[PDB]
Amino acid sequence: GVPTYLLPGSGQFLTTDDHSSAPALPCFNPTPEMHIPGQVRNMLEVVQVE
Amino acid sequence: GVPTYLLPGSGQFLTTDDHSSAPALPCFNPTPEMHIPGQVRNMLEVVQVESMMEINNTESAVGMERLKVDISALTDVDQLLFNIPLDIQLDGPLRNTLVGNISRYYTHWSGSLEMTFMFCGSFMAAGKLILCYTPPGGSCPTTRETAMLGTHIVWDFGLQSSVTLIIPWISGSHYRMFNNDAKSTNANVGYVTCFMQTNLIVPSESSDTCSLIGFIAAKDDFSLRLMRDSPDIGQLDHLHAAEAAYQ
Amino acid sequence: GVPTYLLPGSGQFLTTDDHSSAPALPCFNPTPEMHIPGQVRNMLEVVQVESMMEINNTESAVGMERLKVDISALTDVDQLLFNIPLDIQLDGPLRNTLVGNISRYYTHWSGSLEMTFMFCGSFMAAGKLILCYTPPGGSCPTTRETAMLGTHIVWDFGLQSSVTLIIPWISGSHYRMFNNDAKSTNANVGYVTCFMQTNLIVPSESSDTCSLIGFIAAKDDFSLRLMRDSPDIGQLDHLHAAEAAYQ
Amino acid sequence: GTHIVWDFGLQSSVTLIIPWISGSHYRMFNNDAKSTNANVGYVTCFMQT
Amino acid sequence: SDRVLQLKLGNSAIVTQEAANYCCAYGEWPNYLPDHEAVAIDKPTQPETATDRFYTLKSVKWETGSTGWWWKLPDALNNIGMFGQNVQHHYLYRSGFLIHVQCNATKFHQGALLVVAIPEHQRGAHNTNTSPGFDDIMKGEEGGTFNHPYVLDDGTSLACATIFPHQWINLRTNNSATIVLPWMNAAPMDFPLRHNQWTLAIIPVVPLGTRTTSSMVPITVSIAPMCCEFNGLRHAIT
Amino acid sequence: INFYKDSYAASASKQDFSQDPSKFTEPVVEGLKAGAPVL
Amino acid sequence: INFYKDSYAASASKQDFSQDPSKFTEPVVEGLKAGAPVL
Amino acid sequence: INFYKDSYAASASKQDFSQDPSKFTEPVVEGLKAGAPVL
Amino acid sequence: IESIIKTATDTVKSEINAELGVVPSLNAVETGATSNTEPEEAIQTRTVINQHGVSETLVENFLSRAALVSKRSFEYKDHTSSTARADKNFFKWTINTRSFVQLRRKLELFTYLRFDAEITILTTVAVNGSGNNTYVGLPDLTLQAMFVPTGALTPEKQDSFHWQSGSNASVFFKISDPPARITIPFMCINSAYSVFYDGFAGFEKNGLYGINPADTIGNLCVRIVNEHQPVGFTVTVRVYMKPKHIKAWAPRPPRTLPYMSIANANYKGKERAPNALSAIIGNRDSVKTMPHNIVN
Amino acid sequence: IESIIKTATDTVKSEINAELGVVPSLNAVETGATSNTEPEEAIQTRTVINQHGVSETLVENFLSRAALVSKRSFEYKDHTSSTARADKNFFKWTINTRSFVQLRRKLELFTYLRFDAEITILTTVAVNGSGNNTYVGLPDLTLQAMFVPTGALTPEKQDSFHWQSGSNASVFFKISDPPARITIPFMCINSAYSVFYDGFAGFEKNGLYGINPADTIGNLCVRIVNEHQPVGFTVTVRVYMKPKHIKAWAPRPPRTLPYMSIANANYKGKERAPNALSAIIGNRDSVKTMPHNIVN
């Protein structure tokens, strides 16, 4: 096997972390996307509205 | 060595996970594959096979009698014969079918259905029926003049003994959900009704009552999502001889 | 570092696992290899070597006497001499052979067997036997007219002192299983029987009783699966001087 | 033996072929009906349903 | 065109003028065992016309209270003619079948029979924990009758029995059904006396009815083994 | 990720999208043409 | 690092910098030229 | 996976399918031709 | 016809039809074929590009889910005065997929199955009641699970020499570890397991009906390696099986009546509908009664 | 002839033979050769394409399975009043593969063996009985296993300075950790271990018969590093060995009679058959009696 060692922070749950995680519903096919008006991609678009 | 850190979910056992695992029998050679008829690779192949509807799910109908609908000659015109509810989730005539049984393992469903009716009267028996699918929103039609406004097929008895009514997928949403609320706008499909179009007319020597057998199947536009434990089976205790496996 | 998560089975010790492990003696130089006769690389090479059958596994037969079958002159025709059961799993004449001993380390077996019989009478002794393999399904034949309907070889004593009866692999399934139910349809192989074809005829000065030695081996179409602990060895306590290893 | 199952219908007639099944090239029209050189067999009819 | 049919096997022939196509189970046709699937090494015997021919079983009477009938293969044919002899003299058997069910009536009669070939129809017993016995399962030529056809005598549903290869005999439409069955088994060959690959079931979903003068309405089954082969010759068991 | 030496140790195989429903829906010798009468 | 077979198992997608604030700030049929009177 | 520096640390070697059963089954100087008498 | 299907089929727009001699809505059920009537031929349709996937109904996805197959609780204690039938710090289980009804029904949807079995073993421990009236803690015990082929010699006691496992596959695992996991290959002597077996597995007439031992995966013998503590505990072992690399043949009508025994398909049914012997579907007042009618 | 064999051999169809001077079924056992009669020459065969693999009978797979070789239980406590023979928080074991009969018989199927040995050490702990009448918990002790070559100095006590292990290979492991594992190379002074040795390993006449110390892997000295607790425990250490990179020579008749000692091949046999000195196979009534005859 591969020799390894655990770093500090191993096992912690950070609410702002960004990792992949196990899919609970394998082979699930989400509903196809449909165009909806008024898409917002950055909150700075909202603050520009008076 | 490689520096590493454990993520949340490490060590958990998820029943739907998909990983390789240690072979307990190294160098084992499985029995060579041999062609066997009737291979199935997607459960949607099964739901496309039509199976008998239990339309006569009433008291005084015992066993096989629940699988046929008796029709007799009538002296009033445009009379209602029977109706079939919509939900392939709740208990009903569609529940114990191939499509219903397989679909109840899932939560979301989409696509068109087909209902095929076979007339099982005598050769000398003649008649015309009208079969109507009513999209949801209102009460189930009780008169022919109302039911005929929806989707319908007029069926004439003859050499071709069977007719097909297509229940097309007419839904606001991409999928309907197999929920317990039968009146929900995301579950209700409508109604099926059958009316006399003219009458059942038989000669004296023929049987005065003739039977119809109803079948239901899914078309190839049908699909299912969100697998779940089927409510059609369960246990409150260990089965007989299950303990003997430990002796 | 690398983000990781532990799978189920992490930390377990599986006796059949196959992994590298830390060398306790770094830079150790093993003794150079030297050619040694009789290298064996597959146990199937061993089972192809014929070994003596214990056909005479009866009371009043002690030790080496169990490894030979005595035949004498008879005054009735077509008489049965002996029979051999089929199972290379259960205890029997085939158990303490190379093929039997190696096969009992496994659970599934397939392929053809060969039984070779050597006549050990005097040169002046003459005779003909018939050796029959009966595929399973019925009772072991007790008469020549029934046994000869199965696979058989008619053996004439002569300069070539040994004959071979092939028990071909005749099975509904790819493998038979070494289970404890000898009458199971997945285990039973049939029977072997031996009958006088004419008679054992010897002169006055020759011995009136002559011995046969039976051998069994597997052919090169033979294979085994599902290794298991052999039932041929066991212990209920520590062996003598085992404690002295700790002193 | 050789047989045909006949279903009554629009085609009102059925044909059973008695094929030439004989040890010898010819049979002989002799007076012994049970002779091995004369007997041809039998024809029988049964209800199927 | 699709209503008339002649089946000719060996020295036997059957003609029907009121057929409704015919069913090939799972879209397959019977065939001999190929070398790349064979297990038994002895040269098999292939009797051809001696065994690949129609054998007609005893007819049964369609009554008002009839629950249905079933026959297990090859058990129903195991003592019939040269097929029975070859079965009795050999340890291993392999074949398909051609099943032809016949039932005629008048144009004043009504009734519907489901004719279904069930692979591995493992029967269950009713209201008991004891498994069905040998005599309950192996009925031979005479066959058996369904105790609870509504559940196919195994806790399943008759309504879903159409997933199996099947036809219908609807008396106003047709008077016969025809099903072609290939070899259906986990193993290339089998011991014919202890395992049944197929079970032919005839179930009156719509009961027989008429107001004309009553007559006996029989149902007749003719089964032709196809591509028969046998291995492991020995003395007869019988 | 499969470092085991036995192929049966591998993860599940969910990529076989081939179907043949006709072996259950239309197991008849004569194919039925759409629209035309069956019998 | 995503060894899962389902694409929705992947980590977050924070690379979509496209914006169109005019759909909220100027949702008018006639664009307003800078400097010129609106009405 | 073997990151150790000593070759004997490696996993098992199950790839040697070579056989020579004749060294045990036919260890005779004169080969026996099939069908012909041995002696 | 065989083809690769990844999504549900599309719909094409259709027009009025008034053609003589063409009746797509009429069918012949007697032939055994399912009706081929298309929505385009029954009603006027529009064009619909259907993007609905069909992957979740794949047989592999349908069956490759870890389902509980065995659950055994036994006392971990000094068993000097324990009865003969008690599990004395170990138990044996003949592997079968018929004890828990969900997986059993799913498997019995098919006649033949070929698959490898991923086995996951999960252990839990509790301090015994009716023994000491106190809690002290839970030990991190080591357990051994040994695979013994069907019919072979199984250990007779916790410290039996049979546990030496010279050739049998054994896995040693701790309670504190994640659940143990091993893959057992498809080990049938045939090319596929027989989910249903219409026959007798013996050459005599006294054999078990419907039970083919060739389809029995094997025997699992589970023991606690640790010698007993001065106090007693209750140890529960759960075994979950997940089929994978699955091939399936000849689908069957689903089970409707409740299961009665693991050894047969015997049926009794519920007292009344639903799933009664005389009535599978729940009753309604009449064939003209709409159970959940919308009334406004 | 030497060749690569991956599957069982195929069968070719054969016809009737009536040839003079050709008798393939006759053989001469006296030459010592195994019969070369083929099924094609004995009966009429068909063509069979045999796909059965032969990998599970490879010598490597046959022998490369972890088997128990040592099991030692000792008290972890204050040993001030302990007797001389007691293991005082440590033990020594002369490594041998003859104490547990399964691995011993498998190894003794061959005359010569060359392999490396993967060693796995598994530790379990229990609270002592007959000491305190209570359970408090199990400690996560640290153990040291030191490899001392055969005949070299071994530690005399738990806190002996010999445990400093300046050159001896030592492994330190916790009970809570997975079992310790190390690979010992093939360390024989010869090219292969002598499974059986028909000789005396000394230049005088008093040496041990059948015992070649060159085949003794070495000595394992196992101690608990932790000093003793106020209460006593029982610690059990199991050592499992798995051969790998195996070469084998000169297969031998398998052992039949039960083993008697680890130091020799002495035999007594069971009281009666099976595996008795006068009868290895169980008895039947006569040579004409079929033990499991099928009777219907």
Is J234's Cβ below 8 Å from some Cβ in I? yes
Q: Do J39 and E38 touch (CB under 8 A)?
A: no
Q: Hey, of C20, C40, C221, which one would you mutate to test binding to chain H, going by the most H CBs within 10 A of its CB?
A: C20
Task: Compute the distance between CA of residue J69 and CA of residue J184 in angstroms, rounded to an integer.
Answer: 15
Task: Compute the distance between CA of residue I290 and CA of residue B147 in angstroms, rounded to an integer.
Answer: 14
Please provide the DSSP assignment of I195-239 as one string: SS--BBSBSSS-SPBT--GGG---EEEEEE-SPPPSS-EEEEEEE
> In chain J, where do the E strands start and end?
3-4, 26-27, 67-76, 90-94, 110-127, 142-148, 170-174, 180-184, 193-194, 219-224, 233-251
CB F25 within 8 A of CB F31: no
CATH code: domain of residue B203: 2.60.120.20
Task: Compute the distance between CA of residue C48 and CA of residue C215 in angstroms, rounded to an integer.
Answer: 11
> Beta strand pairing status for J26-27 and C162-167?
antiparallel
Touching, B vs D (3+ Cβ pairs under 8 A): no
Touching, C vs J (3+ Cβ pairs under 8 A): yes
Helix (H, G, I), strand (E, B) or coil at J240: strand
With CA atoms as reference, the chain B residue closest to A32 would be: B174
Please provide the DSSP assignment of I11-35 as one string: B--------TT--TTEE-GGGSPPP
Give the total residue count for chain A: 50
Q: Look up residue B47 and give its DSSP letter.
A: H
* Residue A18 half-sphere exposure toward CB, CA atoms < 13 A: 4
CB C202 within 8 A of CB C122: yes
Task: Compute the distance between CA of residue C25 and CA of residue I224 in angstroms, rounded to an integer.
Answer: 34
CB J125 within 8 A of CB J235: yes
Cα B54 to Cα E217, E218, I251, I287, J195, distances in angstroms: 28, 28, 21, 10, 74
Q: How many CB atoms lie within 10 A of CB C237?
A: 7
> Beta strand pairing status for B2-6 and B51-52?
unpaired
In the CATH hierarchy, which fold is given to the domain comprising E5-233? Jelly Rolls (2.60.120)
Buried b / exposed e over C12-29, threshold 16 CB at 10 Å, is bbbbbbbbbbbbbbeeee
Tokens of I270: 């519920």
Q: Check the CA dihedral J189-J195-J197-J201 and report its sign.
A: positive
Query: Exposed/middle/buried for E113, CB within 10 Å: 0-12, 13-18, 19+?
Result: buried
Place of tokens 């246990």: B235
Task: Compute the distance between CA of residue E235 and CA of residue I110 in angstroms, rounded to an integer.
Answer: 38
Tokens of E202: 């005839």
Question: Of E171, E217, E179, E192, which is closest to residue E74 (Cα–Cα)?
Answer: E192
Instruction: List the domain range (segments joined by +) for residue B75.
Output: 1-247
Task: Compute the distance between CA of residue C13 and CA of residue C15 in angstroms, rounded to an integer.
Answer: 6
Query: Exposed/middle/buried for D34, CB within 10 Å: 0-12, 13-18, 19+?
Result: exposed
Task: Compute the distance between CA of residue J234 and CA of residue J135 in angstroms, rounded to an integer.
Answer: 13
Q: Which long-range contacts (CB under 8 A, 24 or more apart) does D32-39 make?
A: none
Question: Of C11, C23, I222, which is closest to residue J179 (Cα–Cα)?
Answer: C11
Tokens of E96: 């398909």
Q: How many CB atoms lie within 10 A of CB E119?
A: 25
Q: How many CB atoms lie within 10 A of CB E237?
A: 17
In chain E, where the domains are located: 5-233
Q: Do I52 and A29 touch (CB under 8 A)?
A: yes
Q: How many CB atoms lie within 10 A of CB I21?
A: 7
Experimental method: cryo-EM
3-state SS of C175-210 is: CEECCCCCCECCCCCCEEEEEEEEEEECCCCCCCEE
Q: Rg for chain J (alpha carbons), in Å?
A: 27
Counting the structural domains of chain C, the total is 1
Question: Of E218, E197, E87, E68, which is closest to residue E143 (Cα–Cα)?
Answer: E68
CB C217 within 8 A of CB C100: no
Contacts with C4 from chain A: Cβ below 8 Å: 4
Is H31's Cβ below 8 Å from some Cβ in J? no
Q: Do C45 and H6 touch (CB under 8 A)?
A: no
Task: Compute the distance between CA of residue I240 and CA of residue I181 in angstroms, rounded to an integer.
Answer: 9
The CA distance from A49 to the nearest CA of chain C, in Å, is 42
Contacts with B204 from chain E: Cβ below 8 Å: 211
Question: Of J230, H4, C178, which is closest to residue I214 (Cα–Cα)?
Answer: C178
CB A1 within 8 A of CB C19: yes
Cβ contacts of residue E60 below 8 Å, gap of 6+?
E69, E143, E218, E219
Tokens of E85: 């002899």
Cβ contacts of residue E43 below 8 Å, gap of 6+?
J13, J14, J43, J44, J45, J46
Contacts with H2 from chain C: Cβ below 8 Å: 20
CB C111 within 8 A of CB C219: yes
Please provide the DSSP assignment of C136-157 as one string: SSSPPP-SHHHHTTSEEEEEE-
Q: Look up residue I185 and give its DSSP letter.
A: P
Cβ contacts of residue J168 below 8 Å, gap of 6+?
J146, J147, J148
CB J82 within 8 A of CB J199: no
Contacts with H13 from chain C: Cβ below 8 Å: none
Cβ contacts of residue D13 below 8 Å, gap of 6+?
none
Task: Compute the distance between CA of residue B187 and CA of residue B108 in angstroms, rounded to an integer.
Answer: 9
Query: Exposed/middle/buried for D25, CB within 10 Å: 0-12, 13-18, 19+?
Result: exposed
Give the total residue count for chain E: 238
* Distance between start and end Cα atoms, chain G: 56
Angle at C9 between CA J170 and CA I157, to 5 degrees: 80
Task: Compute the distance between CA of residue J207 and CA of residue J205 in angstroms, rounded to an integer.
Answer: 6
Subunits close to C (at least 3 CB pairs below 8 A): A, B, E, H, I, J
Q: Look up residue E49 and give its DSSP letter.
A: G
Strand partners, E169: E113
